[PDB]
Amino acid sequence: PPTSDDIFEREYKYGAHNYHPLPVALERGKGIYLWDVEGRKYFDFLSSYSAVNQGHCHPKIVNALKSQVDKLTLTSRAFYNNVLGEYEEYITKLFNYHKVLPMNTGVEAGETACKLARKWGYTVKGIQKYKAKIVFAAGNFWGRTLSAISSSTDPTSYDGFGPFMPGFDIIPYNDLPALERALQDPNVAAFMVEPIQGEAGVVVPDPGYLMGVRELCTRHQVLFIADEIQTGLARTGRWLAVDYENVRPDIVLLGKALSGGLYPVSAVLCDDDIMLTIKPGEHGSYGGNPLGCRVAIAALEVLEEENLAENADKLGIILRNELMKLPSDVVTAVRGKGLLNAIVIKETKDWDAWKVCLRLRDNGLLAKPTHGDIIRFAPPLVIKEDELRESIEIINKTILSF
Amino acid sequence: PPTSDDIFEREYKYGAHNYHPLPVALERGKGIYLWDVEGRKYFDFLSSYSAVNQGHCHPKIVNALKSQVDKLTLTSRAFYNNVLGEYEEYITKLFNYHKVLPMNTGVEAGETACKLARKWGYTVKGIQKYKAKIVFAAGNFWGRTLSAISSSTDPTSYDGFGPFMPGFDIIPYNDLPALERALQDPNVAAFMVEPIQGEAGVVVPDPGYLMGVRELCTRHQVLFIADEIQTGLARTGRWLAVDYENVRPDIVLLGKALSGGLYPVSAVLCDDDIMLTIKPGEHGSYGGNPLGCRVAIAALEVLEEENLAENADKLGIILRNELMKLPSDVVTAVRGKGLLNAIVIKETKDWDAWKVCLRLRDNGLLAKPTHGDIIRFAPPLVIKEDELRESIEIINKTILSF
């Protein structure tokens, strides 16, 4: 019996107010579709921020989880389990890196990358201890820990949250001269960057930016950290976004879609020269538990077998072609890669991105704005062309209904 | 066909070397027992560091997970799901706090507590922005992020990991005069402490320490943060360890056993005056997903229905009584509360805690040392008295076999 209004009003009373979600209360999910408590059906054009790239409740990942939960779920890393090594070999051979370090959430993988970069700068590069610096790009988002917000240029992320982690420098995104200037400091150990800035509004850098970042990092003995937690795993049309420029980062961060939305699994991929700077007992975490490892194996196998990167590329081309037919007085820009796209809205005194998302919900499509004018479009990579065009028709109806 | 040696040697080749586990390779777990790939049976006296308080693969939690995975697993907090509010109401009424903030891992709950303390110190206490301090106790452990290791006094935790988070002060554990001296600084916003220091070697403070901490925090307008991620949820004989002194902390951190080892779920419990200092969009995370919420509901219901705190208390009394019968030349001290205990070993040139744990494994009992002389004993709270006494016989055999 509990309605949607009963749901909202419940959380407001017993849950922290750290979110303001779109007023819709889902209770079922399958493939590209979501169902609320009233039984209404919606296209999911958010994909839990690329966490359910494989669709909601993919039968293969569900079967993996059900098969593993009956056997063993957590031993802690004080002992070995039989699934972790299998998963590690699979993912290291899949992405062609020597080793992987498993964690749970994306921010944990980012913290691990920072600790790896600092430890490598001290023990390998020879930086005097605790002078090591890490460079980030403005608009970056990699979590909500104190360090993560310390690297942030978004006031809502860091304002009011105490003194901040030192050693984090910030340069403009999509700016090779600025990176070249920042890397003149020999105390810099790494540069962490998103190949596409997701949370900033799907900000796509210019062609050649990733190649330039790799060249500049190699030239000045600086580690290239690619945060592919949102852009990786077929979301942009390739296994990794950096594959669009044939670039091999020093450290690769994976997460989100790594489990298909069934378990918090994240990964830090790199070679021995970097990975083995952390010694036994010096870092760790549910990290590497057998259940999440089975789930992640199944998710990667689903990504590979169903060729979801090619589908993402094709249907994203179609989606961006269709979205640019909207009026210039209505949609000022359409951007993105693969099935990770965004439109920006000319906000007026008559409408805004929040009202557009409300009306989209009213018409059977779920999306959310990220800055009151930028609306994300990222359906699960299992969507077909007819379903894509029906949801595009929904978007057209909603946007031309104003 | 893959043996234990094949398992170890696999991880060594493809996994990061951030751990040195006890050489045993488990592939099945049920209740209090674990089974390795060779089919050998072991008592689990580590309980995944209190994560499987309810035993390995408890049928109720497994059924909750299987029922929820067929419906919905992750929508992200951009939308509402129907399970989160139910779980929030349940846990807030269970622990008698206004609100809960859900996260995934214990270190994330600690980060959330720090951000809450700082935001409350600025917006409520009136500390000038970014002068707020948080006090920790030496020997503390609450994760492996940069902030967590910044508060650590363990060199293996922080050595080589870059400059550290400012605003973290450290005082001795179990020291009320030191806390009283540290809280003279009006810029202190909070004191975070474990009611029993688990990772430090099950360090139990003197009686009255928690009451004194509460009195000193209330007196100087300082938030009392109780990290019960390991000591909570019936592990020490009560719902919370602080319940042994009828103390109500300002913020309570839960995790680990919150899911019975089936999902990374953590919680930050506090009242509105503290919780509502974080506004929508200013903090978040897989946090609050429906699958983990169903799992956590089932885990808390299992803890309450089976009266596991009383069993923990009784069997811990029995276990500590039996352990103190060991020779003084062999075991220099036995300490702990409920089913969270530890013995300390007179390390010589003939044996050590690692060899004792190896021989325990050889005799069918799995444990791990934490400092080369301190061995933890913490079986799942579902253990019975006959099983407890058989495992005590195993411990006696192993310890007297030297």
Side-chain angles (χ1 to χ4, degrees), chain A residues 272-288:
Chain A
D272 286 338
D273 285 349
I274 299 169
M275 193 72 85
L276 297 187
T277 61
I278 294 181
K279 293 174 187 177
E282 294 178 357
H283 183 65
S285 177
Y286 280 80

Side-chain angles (χ1 to χ4, degrees), chain B residues 225-387:
Chain B
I225 300 177
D227 187 350
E228 295 253 12
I229 288 164
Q230 189 165 200
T231 62
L233 310 175
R235 166 58 59 178
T236 69
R238 305 289 193 270
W239 266 115
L240 294 175
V242 298
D243 296 353
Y244 272 107
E245 282 180 40
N246 301 323
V247 168
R248 185 178 198 270
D250 295 302
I251 300 179
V252 174
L253 306 178
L254 295 180
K256 236 100 233 235
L258 187 48
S259 66
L262 275 69
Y263 203 95
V265 181
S266 58
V268 187
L269 289 158
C270 61
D271 281 350
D272 286 338
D273 285 349
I274 299 169
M275 193 72 85
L276 297 187
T277 61
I278 294 181
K279 293 174 187 177
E282 294 178 357
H283 183 65
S285 177
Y286 280 80
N289 68 91
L291 183 53
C293 285
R294 282 275 189 257
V295 164
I297 287 179
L300 292 174
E301 285 181 339
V302 165
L303 292 166
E304 182 175 339
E305 295 178 295
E306 298 183 17
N307 191 15
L308 297 185
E310 198 184 26
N311 191 46
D313 199 11
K314 301 180 184 300
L315 297 190
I317 293 179
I318 287 180
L319 175 60
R320 284 186 300 276
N321 276 341
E322 292 300 274
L323 287 175
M324 284 183 290
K325 298 175 177 176
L326 273 18
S328 297
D329 335 67
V330 164
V331 172
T332 40
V334 184
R335 60 205 182 205
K337 279 192 176 184
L339 281 181
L340 176 68
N341 309 274
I343 61 174
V344 57
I345 287 180
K346 180 76 173 183
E347 172 183 339
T348 69
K349 293 138 52 62
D350 203 293
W351 72 326
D352 52 74
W354 183 264
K355 302 183 181 180
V356 175
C357 286
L358 288 177
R359 194 163 303 186
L360 282 167
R361 174 208 62 181
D362 296 335
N363 289 334
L365 189 143
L366 288 187
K368 177 138 188 301
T370 193
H371 274 102
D373 57 348
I374 303 175
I375 296 185
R376 170 97 59 89
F377 286 142
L381 318 181
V382 299
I383 190 173
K384 309 185 190 308
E385 183 170 354
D386 52 357
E387 304 163 338

Side-chain angles (χ1 to χ4, degrees), chain A residues 72 75 79-80, chain B residues 3-5 7-8 22-47 52 55-56 356-368 378-380 383 387 390-392 394-395 398:
Chain A
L72 180 63
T75 65
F79 316 114
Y80 290 88
Chain B
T3 70
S4 292
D5 278 325
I7 288 181
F8 313 143
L22 197 75
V24 61
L26 296 319
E27 71 165 333
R28 186 188 143 196
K30 190 166 65 182
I32 64 175
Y33 295 115
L34 288 168
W35 288 267
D36 61 0
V37 294
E38 284 83 14
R40 288 173 288 197
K41 194 174 186 175
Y42 309 81
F43 285 94
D44 185 5
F45 263 56
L46 201 142
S47 298
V52 289
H56 287 277
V356 175
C357 286
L358 288 177
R359 194 163 303 186
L360 282 167
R361 174 208 62 181
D362 296 335
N363 289 334
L365 189 143
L366 288 187
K368 177 138 188 301
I383 190 173
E387 304 163 338
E390 179 188 357
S391 46
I392 287 178
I394 294 176
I395 299 174
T398 299

Side-chain angles (χ1 to χ4, degrees), chain B residues 88-147:
Chain B
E88 289 174 340
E89 184 178 0
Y90 179 52
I91 192 174
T92 51
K93 295 186 175 178
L94 177 59
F95 292 95
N96 194 22
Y97 287 91
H98 283 164
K99 286 180 173 58
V100 60
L101 197 155
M103 300 291 288
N104 313 283
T105 62
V107 72
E108 285 182 334
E111 295 267 357
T112 299
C114 286
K115 297 175 70 177
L116 280 167
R118 292 171 156 195
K119 195 91 170 191
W120 172 90
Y122 301 135
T123 56
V124 175
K125 189 171 179 166
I127 300 170
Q128 180 174 289
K129 245 178 183 178
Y130 310 144
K131 287 184 174 182
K133 289 186 159 192
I134 304 179
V135 181
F136 305 83
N140 74 87
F141 184 84
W142 55 283
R144 295 281 194 178
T145 57
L146 289 180
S147 309

Side-chain angles (χ1 to χ4, degrees), chain A residues 7-8 10-29 34 37 46 48-49 51 56-57 62 65-66 69-82 84-86 88-89 92-93 98-101 104-105 107-108 111 114-115 118-119 122 129-130 132 144-147 149 156 158-166 168 256 259 261-264 275-276 278-286 291 366-368, chain B residues 7-8 10-29 34 37 46 48-49 51 56-57 62 65-66 69-82 84-86 88-89 92-93 98-101 104-105 107-108 111 115 118-119 122 129-130 132 144-147 149 156 158-166 168 256 259 261-264 275-276 278-286 291 366-368:
Chain A
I7 288 181
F8 313 143
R10 181 161 57 178
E11 290 194 21
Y12 191 91
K13 185 166 180 57
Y14 301 104
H17 296 181
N18 51 321
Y19 284 99
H20 188 291
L22 197 75
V24 61
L26 296 319
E27 71 165 333
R28 186 188 143 196
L34 288 168
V37 294
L46 201 142
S48 301
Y49 302 101
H56 287 277
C57 303
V62 170
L65 166 139
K66 286 190 176 185
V69 70
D70 282 335
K71 302 177 56 180
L72 180 63
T73 76
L74 180 62
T75 65
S76 76
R77 302 295 304 279
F79 316 114
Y80 290 88
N81 73 85
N82 59 312
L84 175 56
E86 195 183 306
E88 289 174 340
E89 184 178 0
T92 51
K93 295 186 175 178
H98 283 164
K99 286 180 173 58
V100 60
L101 197 155
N104 313 283
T105 62
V107 72
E108 285 182 334
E111 295 267 357
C114 286
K115 297 175 70 177
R118 292 171 156 195
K119 195 91 170 191
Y122 301 135
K129 245 178 183 178
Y130 310 144
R144 295 281 194 178
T145 57
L146 289 180
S147 309
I149 71 182
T156 70
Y158 66 82
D159 193 358
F161 290 120
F164 301 99
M165 172 66 54
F168 290 172
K256 236 100 233 235
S259 66
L262 275 69
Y263 203 95
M275 193 72 85
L276 297 187
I278 294 181
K279 293 174 187 177
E282 294 178 357
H283 183 65
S285 177
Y286 280 80
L291 183 53
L366 288 187
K368 177 138 188 301
Chain B
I7 288 181
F8 313 143
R10 181 161 57 178
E11 290 194 21
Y12 191 91
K13 185 166 180 57
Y14 301 104
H17 296 181
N18 51 321
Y19 284 99
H20 188 291
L22 197 75
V24 61
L26 296 319
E27 71 165 333
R28 186 188 143 196
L34 288 168
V37 294
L46 201 142
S48 301
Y49 302 101
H56 287 277
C57 303
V62 170
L65 166 139
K66 286 190 176 185
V69 70
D70 282 335
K71 302 177 56 180
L72 180 63
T73 76
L74 180 63
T75 65
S76 76
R77 302 295 304 279
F79 316 114
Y80 290 88
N81 73 85
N82 59 312
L84 175 56
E86 195 183 306
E88 289 174 340
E89 184 178 0
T92 51
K93 295 186 175 178
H98 283 164
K99 286 180 173 58
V100 60
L101 197 155
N104 313 283
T105 62
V107 72
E108 285 182 334
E111 295 267 357
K115 297 175 70 177
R118 292 171 156 195
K119 195 91 170 191
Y122 301 135
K129 245 178 183 178
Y130 310 144
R144 295 281 194 178
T145 57
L146 289 180
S147 309
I149 72 182
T156 70
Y158 66 82
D159 193 358
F161 290 120
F164 301 99
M165 172 66 54
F168 290 172
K256 236 100 233 235
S259 66
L262 275 69
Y263 203 95
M275 193 72 85
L276 297 187
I278 294 181
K279 293 174 187 177
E282 294 178 357
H283 183 65
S285 177
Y286 280 80
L291 183 53
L366 288 187
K368 177 138 188 301

